[PDB]
Amino acid sequence: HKHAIPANIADRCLINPEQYETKYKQSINDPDTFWGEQGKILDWITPYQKVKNTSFAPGNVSIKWYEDGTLNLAANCLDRHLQENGDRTAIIWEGDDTSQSKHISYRELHRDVCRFANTLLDLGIKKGDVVAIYMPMVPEAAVAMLACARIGAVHSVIFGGFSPEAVAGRIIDSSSRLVITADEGVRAGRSIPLKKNVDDALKNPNVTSVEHVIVLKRTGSDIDWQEGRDLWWRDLIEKASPEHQPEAMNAEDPLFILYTSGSTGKPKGVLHTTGGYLVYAATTFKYVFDYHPGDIYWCTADVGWVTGHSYLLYGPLACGATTLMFEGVPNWPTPARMCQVVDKHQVNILYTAPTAIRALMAEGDKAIEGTDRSSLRILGSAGEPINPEAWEWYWKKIGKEKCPVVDTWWQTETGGFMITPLPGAIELKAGSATRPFFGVQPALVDNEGHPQEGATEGNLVITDSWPGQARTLFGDHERFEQTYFSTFKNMYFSGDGARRDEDGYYWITGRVDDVLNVSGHRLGTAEIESALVAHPKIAEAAVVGIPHAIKGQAIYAYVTLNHGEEPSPELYAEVRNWVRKEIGPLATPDVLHWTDSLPKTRSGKIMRRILRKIAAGDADPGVVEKLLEEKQA
């Protein structure tokens, strides 16, 4: 079953099937003309001359786009929209409590970004300084990210659900000079500590770089205050001049770092530059969502994740959209919350995640009860695979069978959408990301690196660069080259597996490395094992993912205690809380399986394939039998 392109979409679409085909072929055959022309979606301070300048050569990866052009992201997201659209809403903010919302016009946002840019400059922040942002889903998170970009500071946004230890690791690695936070965030009626977590983070004796903490009063909770270091947001911004002249950034000036979990090691800072990234986010946002002036757009992703960077803030604002920032969760106070927000603000484009869809579907019709949903023209899904059944529930209940669903496959490392439908150009298959975006050349290779032709499956690689590609890993270009460009030479390895069907549509099966997907959150099995083994009573651990109906994968941890320690309710609780402390609640094992029987190769390497199979139900060979009975209990 292919879903046809509906007439209302065909009548209005920016790109039809023929235009998709033609532009696709040109992006591939002639990237310099294609991306040379498409780069004009942005305003450049000085024009680029060179367009594509890239190599995936082994141990010698170099990615540059538009390299001689200069520009300012904040000017593209704000300034250039003032003359025509200064009165238009830039951001609709919907509170965790429905009595709370705000409309923030382009003019108002610009003025606050200008005030906050001066605040930053007056505080001593300079172009290239890294600024850590640990904020909830409030408009001020946006102001802080845009102010940083405006001055050429390099923001590093840390998701609010990270623990103080996780916050400190990111601060240490990036040498962040400043932390921007709130006293607390508000989520599903609960107040979540943020500033306290920062206080704990800065007590780590390896944190040396942070000179100030800017705190937004979001809840007025009693916090500890260090005079001098700590500064209230309101105090600072109100003293700052609202006049700020944006300076030109080179196309290859660093824009942001985003810590991202890998197959091995601890999270690394995926680094995006300015020009290609922003051309790519604005271009993909515009065509995949079929954005028309006046469309109300809603991405539900947190600002702490890449989806929140590219498609909550940067892509939409570049295009002059009204973008909605929701503080809470789609099913609080009730499962109908998400659709209530859609009606309240007349959302035309809704972009969400399969975990949220599956949580709402588990509530059947309570998800749509009392709601109208008519304003909706376009639906999106990203972050994890969506089965045909969930896709169909989404298409029917939320979109009322009237809205194309754009299932967008991509990654932190890709900056923007990679394999995705375009709503007026491509016919949909439930559960398929479908076809590559402009400038994207995917392939499927076997474990030896041989391309597989026709209907097939294999390792999903991208065989050439695209403007939005991550340029490096902060402080570690060698690890960037190793992780992504060493498995299959001269190719970008995504670490995902995929099938290609008889039509040439891609079906992403999931990570083939040791990376988990837990409620749409990318986590490394290695880092969770490191966190566990750091516990004074734990000798060894092996972490796998198991299928879970809502979350996609749940975390299953095999744990070996040091001699002289026993399993108890207490130790169970302590070990789970230890992971919460090391990483955050998102990384907490759902199951602890206590064992002295980790399977290992003769060289001592833990073999996870079998652990994966046992946990799901599907040197010393005796360990498998012990493991089987332990699992059954």
Ligand X SMILES: CCCOP(=O)(O)OC[C@H]1O[C@@H](n2cnc3c(N)ncnc32)[C@H](O)[C@@H]1O
Ligand Y SMILES: CC(C)(COP(=O)(O)OP(=O)(O)OC[C@H]1O[C@@H](n2cnc3c(N)ncnc32)[C@H](O)[C@@H]1OP(=O)(O)O)[C@@H](O)C(=O)NCCC(=O)NCCS
Specify binding-site residues: 187-190, 307, 331, 383-385, 407-412, 496, 511, 519, 522, 533, 535, 538, 580
Query: Which of ligand Y, ligand X, none is residue 511 near (CB under 5 to 8 Å by kind)?
Result: ligand X
Give the shortest CB-204-to-ligand X separation in angstroms: 26
Residues 221/226/227/230 CA torsion (nearest 10 deg): -70
Q: Which stretch binds ligand X (CB under 6 A): 175-183, 344-352, 506-514, 548-556?
A: 506-514
The residues, ordered by sequence, that sit 6+ positions from 264 with a Cβ below 8 Å of its Cβ are 514, 524, 526
Query: Which of ligand X, ligand Y, none is residue 161 near (CB under 5 to 8 Å by kind)?
Result: ligand Y
| C-alpha distances out from residue 348 to 5, 101, 321, 372, Å | 17, 18, 11, 13
> What does the per-residue mask of binding to ligand X show for 260-299, with x meaning CB under 6 A?
x---------------------------------------
Closer residue to ligand X (CB): 140 or 407: 407
> What does the per-residue mask of binding to ligand X show for 389-428, with x meaning CB under 6 A?
------------------xxxxxx----------------
Structure-token pair, residue 372: 């109208």
Query: Which of ligand X, ligand Y, none is residue 550 near (CB under 5 to 8 Å by kind)?
Result: ligand Y
User: Helices marked H in 137-232 — which ranges?
Assistant: 139-151, 164-174, 195-203
Number of residues near ligand X (by CB under 6 A):
21
444 binds ligand X, rule: CB under 6 A: no
Site for ligand Y in 187-226 (CB under 6 A): 187, 192
Query: Which of ligand X, ligand Y, none is residue 162 near (CB under 5 to 8 Å by kind)?
Result: none
> What does the per-residue mask of binding to ligand Y show for 157-186, with x meaning CB under 6 A?
---xx-----------------------x-
Specify binding-site residues for ATP: 383-385, 407-412, 496, 511, 522
Give the shortest CB-548-to-ligand Y separation in angstroms: 9
Site for ligand Y in 340-379 (CB under 6 A): 353, 355-356, 359
508 binds ligand X, rule: CB under 6 A: yes
Q: Which residue has the tokens 């970004």?
A: 113
Looking at 114, 306, 319, 425, which residue binds ligand X (CB under 6 A)? Answer: 306
511 binds ligand X, rule: CB under 6 A: yes
Spatial CA neighbour of 469 closest among 271, 260, 251, 314: 271
What is the number of the residue whose Cβ is closest to ligand X? 412
Query: Which of ligand Y, ligand X, none is residue 359 near (CB under 5 to 8 Å by kind)?
Result: ligand Y
Distance of CA 106 to the CA centre of its chain: 25
Site for ligand Y in 51-110 (CB under 6 A): none
Distance of CA 572 to the CA centre of its chain: 31
Query: Which of ligand Y, ligand X, none is residue 496 near (CB under 5 to 8 Å by kind)?
Result: ligand X
Closer residue to ligand Y (CB): 150 or 551: 551
Q: Is 139 helix (H, G, I), strand (E, B) or coil?
A: helix
Spatial CA neighbour of 495 closest among 460, 534, 533, 531: 460
307 binds ligand X, rule: CB under 6 A: yes
Give the shortest CB-141-to-ligand Y separation in angstroms: 11
| C-alpha distances out from residue 605 to 340, 495, 539, 599, Å | 51, 21, 15, 8
Radius of gyration of the chain (CA): 24
Give the shortest CB-518-to-ligand Y separation in angstroms: 8
The residues, ordered by sequence, that sit 6+ positions from 25 with a Cβ below 8 Å of its Cβ are none
Closer residue to ligand Y (CB): 76 or 181: 181
| C-alpha distances out from residue 606 to 18, 445, 528, 592, Å | 51, 26, 15, 17
Angle, helices 106-123/139-151, rounded to nearest 10 degrees:
60
260 binds ligand Y, rule: CB under 6 A: no
Sign of CA dihedral 228, 230, 232, 237: positive
330 binds ligand Y, rule: CB under 6 A: yes
Quote helix, strand, coil % in the chain, to nearest 5: 35, 25, 40
Give the shortest CB-331-to-ligand Y separation in angstroms: 4
Q: Is 629 helix (H, G, I), strand (E, B) or coil?
A: helix
Q: Provide DSSP, 451-502.
A: B--SSEEEEEEE-S--TT---EETT-HHHHHHHHHTTTTTSEEEEEEEEE-T
The DSSP 8-state label assigned to residue 404 in this structure reads -
> For residues 413 and 484, what is the distance between their CA atoms, to the nearest angstrom?
9
The residues, ordered by sequence, that sit 6+ positions from 272 with a Cβ below 8 Å of its Cβ are 254, 255, 256, 257, 258, 415, 468, 470, 471
Task: Quote the Cα angle for 625-551-543, to 5°.
Answer: 35
Specify binding-site residues for CoA: 187-190, 307, 331, 519, 580
319 binds ligand Y, rule: CB under 6 A: no
497 binds ligand X, rule: CB under 6 A: no
Query: Which of ligand X, ligand Y, none is residue 411 near (CB under 5 to 8 Å by kind)?
Result: ligand X
The DSSP 8-state label assigned to residue 46 in this structure reads B
Closer residue to ligand Y (CB): 138 or 460: 138
Positions in the binding site for ligand X (CB under 6 A): 260, 306-307, 382-385, 407-412, 433, 494-496, 508, 510-511, 522
Q: Which residues bind ligand Y (CB under 6 A)?
A: 160-161, 185, 187, 192, 302, 329-331, 353, 355-356, 359, 519, 550, 585-586
